[PDB]
Design a protein around this motif. Structure first.
Motif, PDB file in Angstrom:
ATOM      1  N   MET A 141       0.846  -1.236   0.000  1.00 22.40           N
ATOM      2  CA  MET A 141       0.000   0.000   0.000  1.00 22.40           C
ATOM      3  C   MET A 141       0.866   1.266   0.000  1.00 22.40           C
ATOM      4  SD  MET A 141      -2.199   1.912   2.998  1.00 22.40           S
ATOM      5  CE  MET A 141      -0.633   1.704   3.835  1.00 22.40           C
ATOM      6  N   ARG A 142       1.684   1.377  -1.152  1.00 23.92           N
ATOM      7  CA  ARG A 142       2.355   2.757  -1.062  1.00 23.92           C
ATOM      8  C   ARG A 142       1.244   3.720  -1.483  1.00 23.92           C
ATOM      9  NH1 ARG A 142       7.218   4.362  -2.079  1.00 23.92           N
ATOM     10  NH2 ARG A 142       6.197   5.547  -3.707  1.00 23.92           N
ATOM     11  N   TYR A 143       1.182   4.909  -0.912  1.00 25.54           N
ATOM     12  CA  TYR A 143       0.114   5.876  -1.241  1.00 25.54           C
ATOM     13  C   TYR A 143       0.694   7.267  -1.396  1.00 25.54           C
ATOM     14  CZ  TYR A 143       0.557   6.907   3.721  1.00 25.54           C
ATOM     15  OH  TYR A 143       1.090   7.244   4.922  1.00 25.54           O
TER      16      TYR A 143
ATOM     17  N   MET B  20       4.555   4.138 -11.869  1.00 24.13           N
ATOM     18  CA  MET B  20       5.940   4.049 -11.365  1.00 24.13           C
ATOM     19  C   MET B  20       5.996   4.253  -9.856  1.00 24.13           C
ATOM     20  SD  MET B  20       9.183   6.355 -12.281  1.00 24.13           S
ATOM     21  CE  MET B  20       8.676   8.035 -11.944  1.00 24.13           C
ATOM     22  N   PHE B  21       5.299   5.251  -9.359  1.00 23.22           N
ATOM     23  CA  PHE B  21       5.347   5.631  -7.934  1.00 23.22           C
ATOM     24  C   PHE B  21       4.561   4.666  -7.049  1.00 23.22           C
ATOM     25  CE2 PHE B  21       6.701   9.954  -9.379  1.00 23.22           C
ATOM     26  CZ  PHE B  21       7.928   9.861  -8.783  1.00 23.22           C
ATOM     27  N   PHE B  22       3.445   4.139  -7.506  1.00 23.47           N
ATOM     28  CA  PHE B  22       2.581   3.290  -6.652  1.00 23.47           C
ATOM     29  C   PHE B  22       2.443   1.872  -7.188  1.00 23.47           C
ATOM     30  CE2 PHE B  22       1.090   7.763  -6.360  1.00 23.47           C
ATOM     31  CZ  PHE B  22       1.721   7.986  -5.167  1.00 23.47           C
TER      32      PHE B  22
ATOM     33  N   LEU C 128      12.258   5.483 -15.086  1.00 24.61           N
ATOM     34  CA  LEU C 128      11.667   4.200 -14.610  1.00 24.61           C
ATOM     35  C   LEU C 128      12.793   3.434 -13.900  1.00 24.61           C
ATOM     36  CD1 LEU C 128      10.270   1.079 -15.908  1.00 24.61           C
ATOM     37  CD2 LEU C 128       9.214   2.713 -14.336  1.00 24.61           C
ATOM     38  N   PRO C 129      12.819   3.205 -12.562  1.00 21.34           N
ATOM     39  CA  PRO C 129      13.942   2.485 -11.955  1.00 21.34           C
ATOM     40  C   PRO C 129      14.069   1.089 -12.590  1.00 21.34           C
ATOM     41  CG  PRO C 129      12.687   3.602 -10.265  1.00 21.34           C
ATOM     42  CD  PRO C 129      11.875   3.661 -11.543  1.00 21.34           C
ATOM     43  N   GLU C 130      15.303   0.619 -12.797  1.00 19.84           N
ATOM     44  CA  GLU C 130      15.613  -0.608 -13.577  1.00 19.84           C
ATOM     45  C   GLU C 130      14.910  -1.856 -13.040  1.00 19.84           C
ATOM     46  OE1 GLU C 130      19.316   0.639 -12.346  1.00 19.84           O
ATOM     47  OE2 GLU C 130      18.843   2.131 -13.869  1.00 19.84           O
ATOM     48  N   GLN C 131      14.883  -2.069 -11.727  1.00 13.16           N
ATOM     49  CA  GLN C 131      14.390  -3.352 -11.157  1.00 13.16           C
ATOM     50  C   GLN C 131      12.865  -3.376 -11.071  1.00 13.16           C
ATOM     51  OE1 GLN C 131      17.133  -5.745  -9.108  1.00 13.16           O
ATOM     52  NE2 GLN C 131      18.231  -5.177 -10.961  1.00 13.16           N
ATOM     53  N   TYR C 132      12.174  -2.268 -11.346  1.00  9.55           N
ATOM     54  CA  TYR C 132      10.696  -2.233 -11.418  1.00  9.55           C
ATOM     55  C   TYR C 132      10.231  -2.402 -12.874  1.00  9.55           C
ATOM     56  CZ  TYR C 132      10.932  -0.479  -6.598  1.00  9.55           C
ATOM     57  OH  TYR C 132      11.176  -0.350  -5.263  1.00  9.55           O
ATOM     58  N   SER C 133      11.140  -2.498 -13.848  1.00 10.97           N
ATOM     59  CA  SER C 133      10.783  -2.565 -15.288  1.00 10.97           C
ATOM     60  C   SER C 133       9.958  -3.803 -15.645  1.00 10.97           C
ATOM     61  CB  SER C 133      12.005  -2.425 -16.171  1.00 10.97           C
ATOM     62  OG  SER C 133      13.006  -3.363 -15.837  1.00 10.97           O
ATOM     63  N   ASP C 134      10.273  -5.001 -15.165  1.00 10.44           N
ATOM     64  CA  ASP C 134       9.514  -6.199 -15.621  1.00 10.44           C
ATOM     65  C   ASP C 134       8.062  -6.175 -15.149  1.00 10.44           C
ATOM     66  OD1 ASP C 134      11.854  -6.721 -13.867  1.00 10.44           O
ATOM     67  OD2 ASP C 134      10.492  -8.302 -13.112  1.00 10.44           O
ATOM     68  N   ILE C 135       7.671  -5.482 -14.084  1.00 11.13           N
ATOM     69  CA  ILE C 135       6.202  -5.420 -13.821  1.00 11.13           C
ATOM     70  C   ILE C 135       5.599  -4.161 -14.461  1.00 11.13           C
ATOM     71  CG2 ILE C 135       6.476  -6.720 -11.682  1.00 11.13           C
ATOM     72  CD1 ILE C 135       5.863  -4.255 -10.146  1.00 11.13           C
ATOM     73  N   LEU C 136       6.394  -3.143 -14.799  1.00 11.78           N
ATOM     74  CA  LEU C 136       5.876  -1.870 -15.365  1.00 11.78           C
ATOM     75  C   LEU C 136       6.104  -1.779 -16.874  1.00 11.78           C
ATOM     76  CD1 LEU C 136       7.194   0.457 -12.529  1.00 11.78           C
ATOM     77  CD2 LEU C 136       4.977  -0.663 -12.707  1.00 11.78           C
ATOM     78  N   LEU C 137       6.754  -2.742 -17.506  1.00  9.86           N
ATOM     79  CA  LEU C 137       6.959  -2.656 -18.968  1.00  9.86           C
ATOM     80  C   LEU C 137       6.250  -3.859 -19.618  1.00  9.86           C
ATOM     81  CD1 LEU C 137      10.613  -1.431 -19.629  1.00  9.86           C
ATOM     82  CD2 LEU C 137       8.525  -0.105 -19.644  1.00  9.86           C
TER      83      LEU C 137
END
Ligand SMILES: CC[C@@H](C#N)NC(=O)c1ccccc1
Lengths: 300, 237
Positions: free
Chosen positions: A54-56, A215-217, A258-267
């Motif tokens: 729950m990041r908000y 990206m943020f949440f 886009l931070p590198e390690q968040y790319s596979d769920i955000l790309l």
């Protein structure tokens, strides 16, 4: 330069302001964020040390009022509020600055990143996507679902992004089934740009807000919305030259940030490979293709 | 979802459904040009749309004129199939419209779904079966009407002849698929098998010969033999 004071920091929390973030320890003497650039929207956002789920956070524009954060121990989150008493606010802020209990928004002078990420984002449009009209600021979190997601359950807490659906009657003119499905120009230019968004700036603004929420949440409906709006342009044979050139710039800075390690769920592999290599606009995103290939060649 | 060996008796329940097969919609001969380049010449085709329960076949003939001046014909064939299936449904009374349309190739799903947006309650499904409907043009009367057409034309057939008077749909469809599998694996042998005996004829209003129950068992055995055989000739077993 504006200020978002904090009443206090009772719980340990990782605080973000736009693309910056910092750790505040449980009951650390912390009283807010100063030197926030005027003229842009901003997003303050939080990740509790105890519960990283729950990041908000809150989208706001300091021109629209004096805002502060205050922890609520009942609902257990940092809440944004408006101070209507302008004199009380200046006094509070000045006291906290004199005591130097505020972090400074740390913008490098050369750095146009935030501007580039928020160029077409306007608070007035954010507030129509995030409906809570009694506040001038807008709350988003990881779990909020989109209007389109709810069609496939609480409407008050939803993200009212423009619904885009390539296999819909809105998208497909009777008798142009093949033509409209393979060349979405009609849907982009007449339905969406001329009809719904009115101009490409509102379109780009929703697109950028969708990415930033994504990206943020890690908001999943937002990521879906961002890819959909990209794919609709890339799959249109007829797109104004100025829109293509601006899209290339928009995406470029999103990919860069886009931070590198968040790319596979955000790309989305399918959308990017299609947009960059199969679509009508495969040759029209030079900057985006070059950064994608140097930074995420695996996805491609 | 997708249609496979496990949900196979669904075909014979009382929800109207159609198989659609597009294999034979765009058909070409490849030849050399005077300059020694290669070129295609299109020949007439057909959409094979079949109600597996009743045997009713809606054979939409695709005349080569459809292709004139068009580009990317293989992709257009898919959309043309979809347009013609959707026109067929719209022509049918509401109580005759299918509740599902099963396509034999997954490339037809998006084309059909877009053309059927007006029918949200008609389920468009793929299948995991390797159905032999492509061999439909090995049925002489079907091939004959396709090749003779000089314009677009819908011809209506019952692909089971009168079989349903004596067998269930499940058995009827199993027989059909065995005949067509055989015709696809070795057309000459398959047809030899079907016509060897000149005393068994094809009624004018039928597609297949007028075999007795006992004769159909023999025929069916011969087709199974053929299909196992050609499988050896091919894999050496
Ligand atoms: C998909 C990961 C995503 C989520 N949730 N993002 C972050 O946590 C994060 C935090 C701060 C700044 C940038 C990114």
């Amino acid at each position: 330069m504006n200020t978002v004071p904090f009443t206090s920091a009772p719980i340990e929390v990782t605080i973000g302001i736009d693309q910056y973030s910092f750790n505040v320890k449980e009951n650390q003497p912390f009283h807010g964020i100063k030197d926030i650039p005027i003229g842009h929207v901003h997003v303050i956002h939080f990740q509790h040390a105890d519960n990283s789920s729950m990041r908000y956070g809150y989208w706001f524009d300091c021109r629209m009022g004096n805002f502060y954060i205050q922890y609520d121990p009942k609902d257990g989150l940092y809440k944004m509020m408006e101070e209507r008493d302008g004199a009380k606010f200046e006094n509070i802020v000045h006291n906290f600055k004199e005591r130097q209990m505020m972090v400074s928004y740390p913008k490098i002078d050369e750095d146009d990143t935030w501007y580039n990420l928020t160029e077409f984002v306007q608070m007035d449009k954010i507030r129509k996507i995030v409906r809570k009209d009694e506040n001038q600021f807008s709350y988003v979190d990881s779990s909020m679902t989109t209007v389109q997601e709810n069609e496939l359950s609480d409407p008050a807490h939803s993200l009212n992004y423009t619904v885009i659906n390539f296999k819909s009657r809105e998208a497909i003119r009777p008798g142009h089934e093949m033509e409209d499905f393979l060349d979405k120009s009609y849907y982009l230019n007449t339905v969406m740009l001329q009809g719904i968004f009115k101009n490409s700036s509102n379109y780009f603004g929703e697109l950028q807000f969708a990415f930033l929420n994504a990206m943020f949440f890690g908001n999943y409906g937002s990521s879906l919305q961002w890819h959909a709006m990209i794919e609709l342009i890339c799959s249109s044979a007829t797109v104004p030259k100025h829109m293509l050139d601006k899209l290339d710039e928009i995406l470029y800075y999103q990919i860069k940030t886009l931070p590198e390690q968040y790319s596979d769920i955000l790309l989305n592999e399918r959308v990017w490979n299609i947009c960059l290599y199969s679509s009508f606009q495969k040759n029209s995103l030079h900057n985006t293709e070059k950064i994608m290939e140097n930074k995420y060649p695996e996805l491609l | 979802g997708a249609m496979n060996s496990s949900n196979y008796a669904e075909l014979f329940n009382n929800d109207i459904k159609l198989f659609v097969d597009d294999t034979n919609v765009y058909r070409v001969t490849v030849h050399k040009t005077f300059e020694g380049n290669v070129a295609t010449k299109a020949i007439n085709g057909c959409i094979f749309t079949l109600n597996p329960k009743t045997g009713h076949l809606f054979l939409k003939i695709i005349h080569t004129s459809v292709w004139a001046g068009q580009k990317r014909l293989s992709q257009l064939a898919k959309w043309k199939t979809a347009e013609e299936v959707s026109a067929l449904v719209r022509s049918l009374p509401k109580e005759e419209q299918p509740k599902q349309i099963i396509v034999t190739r997954k490339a037809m799903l998006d084309p059909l779904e877009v053309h059927m947006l007006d029918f949200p309650n008609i389920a468009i499904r793929p299948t995991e079966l390797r159905l032999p409907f492509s061999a439909a043009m090995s049925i002489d009367k079907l091939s004959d009407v396709v090749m003779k057409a000089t314009e677009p034309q819908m011809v209506l057939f019952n692909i089971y002849d009168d079989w349903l008077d004596r067998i269930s749909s499940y058995t009827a469809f199993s027989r059909l698929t065995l005949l067509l599998r055989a015709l696809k694996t070795n057309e000459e042998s398959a047809k030899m098998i079907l016509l060897s005996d000149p005393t068994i004829t094809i009624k004018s209003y039928h597609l297949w010969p007028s075999f007795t129950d006992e004769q159909w068992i023999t025929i069916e055995s011969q087709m199974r033999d053929l299909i196992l055989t050609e499988y050896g000739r091919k894999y050496n077993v």
